[model samples]
Target: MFNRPILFDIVSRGSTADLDGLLPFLLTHKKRLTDEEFREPSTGKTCLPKALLNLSNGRNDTIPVLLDIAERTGNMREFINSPFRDIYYRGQTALHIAIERRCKHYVELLVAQGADVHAQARGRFFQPKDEGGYFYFGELPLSLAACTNQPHIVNYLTENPHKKADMRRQDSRGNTVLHALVAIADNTRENTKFVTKMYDLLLLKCARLFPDSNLEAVLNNDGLSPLMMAAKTGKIGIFQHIIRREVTDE
Candidate 1:
């Protein structure tokens, strides 16, 4: 079988790499595995699946190959849920990196490839609280999009056809997408506008997309619902948007 080293280089070096031919060849190994995973074992610098590497680096051309690998291995459902840690960014999935990197193309490709729109990422990520360091991170694609204030990504996940039924997917803190939205929302410059847009989408789009799984009114482990978080954080805009749509315990 091929090694993760040279082929890793090949996939990334698209400038000279023959993807059309090389890609199909790579997937031919019925039991082939390129290292499966890697790491320094000291600082814990690590590598994961070929798809993970390709995604972190934004290798869009090779995405089809990776998805084929997933299909060959089993199903996109398992591959998407599988853990891919030590991404150099510390904690995040291929989708998270795509979102963080603002690679909408990759995000769309990932979703199209059956990447779980609701996969919960559990890793160490940066939280900007004073000088907040890395913490045990947990979040859905929608929650992450809201935190970063990416309306496009937020809309994509919310409108996804294969997304979770419970649009109110919770994180490690037991906080749903709405809970995280209000818990860490702001009104600085354009942030308020994005927050409002995402908040409304969840209410209007997500509410209707799924089978009426209301998350806005539901609370987190801290006993503060999305509405409560909005009030607690004193986000007038968010609070208003929330209250106006406060029809059920969603």
Candidate 2:
């Protein structure tokens, strides 16, 4: 009578060596646990994904096994669309989890397997325990990667022709991905470069898709474009970049 959560616990906590035995056991009985979603004992709204839980918890071995199960059961739907609702994750997919975990390998794997690049989380990640945490929502994968300043992931998503992202897409609150970068841009660890790269990537895509397109149209509910936000925040590099580009285009 073992189940998915029990197996998830085993796989997530176990070492790579344990995966050899653990994976086969789960696959053999996946039919029983295939669609069984687990909820947190506390809030009960914390519905977590199986393989995604593993990937976020750093279980690389589980990747192949879970992909295999998806292939066999024709339930790739779960892998692609399932939302992870936990204290930390809120409602996001494996791709978003990999981005937060900074696990580039899993990010690539999830994308290659046809995970939705455009999936946004449930309302900016609620933290009921915090009582007065930051209230936000509609976070896209590219937004998360940009905010985290993961240049590698940013470049991969933008450059991979197979993966499509509406770079101009904004969240429900009108928070564009560039708007996020404006807030999170750091001068350390070369994050400034990452921030600039994300902005560049977004503007570049918009140009090819819509010539003479004004990205200033990509404004938030606060009536802030990436450039204006950068100006207010004193993001000199970003401000400079935007100014220079605006000049070059004219």
Candidate 3:
């Protein structure tokens, strides 16, 4: 029982060699791998999320190997989707961290391993500023990538072969990726530029991903479309972009 925490600490240290030697022992101790009893006390993050975030630069293979071990142990799905138990990154699983870390390769591997792209990380860290959240990235991985300006990651997420995130998916706030983009705008020149760019990129991707779905027309909890939300939040650039697109369409 005490060994569980030590085993978790070994993975935390990113020692694949030690892990390799321990696999046979782990195979015998299958319950150790499958159970969730040894997570960090404060963050409630289990071994998998910590491992995903702990891998050293120039080495991303730890997670793939860990996934294989979890697969062998029959806990792959739970391992990949395990969310932190605390309120900070609460509800955010390994895939969400991969997206926030801007690792396209990690995103691909997690998705291929059956990670839930639509999983919402509604932790307080992801809540709206008005609601006391410090960092709001739209809850979903798609929004996280878009808000973080990882265009490459956003492109991979929406158009990836494994599992595409629902373009119209809304957070608890009833805000879509579009609305999330609008919510992050503060009118600074640099912020406005990237937000506007990502907003248009999302629209472009959604159009191709779901041609029949009028994503823009979808209203959020506030009963406002992305365009209306932009105006309300004083995101003039996004507001005007929506206006101009409509004018040009006709």
> Which candidate gets the maximum lDDT versus the true structure?
3
Better of 1 and 2 by TM-score: 2
* TM agreement with the true structure for every prediction: 0.72, 0.74, 0.89
Candidate with the greatest TM-score versus the true structure:
3
1 or 3: which has the higher lDDT? Answer: 3
Tens-digit lDDT string for candidate 1 (1-250):
3444555565554432443444355456443322243222332222223434454455545556656664665446555544455533333566766776777787787777766666666645434552343333237777777777777777777665765325566777888766776766666747667777777777676656554565566678888787777777788877877666565547
* CA-lDDT, candidates in order: 0.60, 0.65, 0.78
Ranking by TM-score: 3, 2, 1
Q: Over 4 Å off in model 2, which ranges?
A: 14-34, 37-59, 122-138, 186-193, 232-237, 248-250
Tens digits of per-residue lDDT, candidate 3, 1-250, equal 2355776676677776667655566667655444655566677576778777776783445566778877886678877777774545568788887876677787888898899888888765444544543477788988888898899988888777888888889998888998899888877889888988898787877788689998889899879998888888788867887788778887
Error of 1 at 121 (Å): 2.2
Model 1, C-alpha of 250: deviation from truth (Å): 18
Q: What TM-score does prediction 3 earn?
A: 0.89
Clashing pairs in 2: 123-137, 124-136, 124-137
Task: Provide the lowest-lDDT 10-residue window in model 1.
Answer: 39-48
